[PDB]
Amino acid sequence: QNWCVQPGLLEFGVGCSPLATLSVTNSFCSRQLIEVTCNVPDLVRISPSECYVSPDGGHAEIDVRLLRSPRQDLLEREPLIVVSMENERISVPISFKF
């Protein structure tokens, strides 16, 4: 409603940059701290993982750098980037192309 994350999917692997970038837009009336995390440890390097975003449509750009491939076979969770802002969370799935 008051904020959003683009794109809606992060693509790594064959044909892709080793680097993906997220854009987080804050349309609340006040400046907001965000935290950007991954639901699988030691899978990506997120930079910066915390920053402030200006209100009224300000935005921050966040690098996501894949460190290893996910192991669905080793029953890791389906990998997600999670952005947290105010009391809310938006998840962005990660795909690795073979």
Residue numbers in the entry: 1049 to 1146
Give the article text:
An evolutionary analysis reveals that most Spd-2/CEP192 proteins contain additional ASH domains located close to the SP2D domain (one in Drosophila melanogaster and six in Homo sapiens; see Results). To partially validate the AF2 structural models, we solved the high-resolution structures of individual ASH domains from DmSpd-2 and H. sapiens CEP192 by crystallography (DmASH3 and HsASH7) to resolutions of 1.93 and 1.0 Å, respectively, or by nuclear magnetic resonance (NMR) spectroscopy (DmASH1). Instead, DmSP2D is essential for PCM scaffold assembly, a function that does not appear to require the additional ASH3 domain. Fusions in which the SP2D or its constituent individual ASH1 or ASH2 domains were deleted all failed to rescue the sterility of Spd-2−/− females, but the ASH3 deletion rescued this sterility nearly as well as the WT protein, although more variably. In contrast, Spd-2-∆ASH3-GFP was present at centrosomes at only slightly lower levels than WT Spd-2-GFP, and it appeared to be distributed more evenly between the centrioles and PCM than the WT protein. A 3D-SIM FRAP analysis suggested that Spd-2-∆ASH3-GFP was initially recruited to centrioles and then spread outward into the scaffold more quickly than the WT protein. The deletion of ASH3 did not significantly perturb the assembly of the residual scaffold in cnn−/− embryos, but the deletion of the SP2D, or of ASH1 or ASH2 individually, appeared to abolish the assembly of this residual scaffold. Collectively, these data indicate that the SP2D and ASH1 and ASH2 are required for Spd-2 and PCM scaffold assembly in vivo, while ASH3 is not. In flies, the single additional ASH domain is not essential for the Spd-2 function (as Spd-2-∆ASH3-GFP can rescue the female sterility of Spd-2 mutants) nor for Spd-2 scaffold assembly or for targeting Spd-2 to the centriole/centrosome.
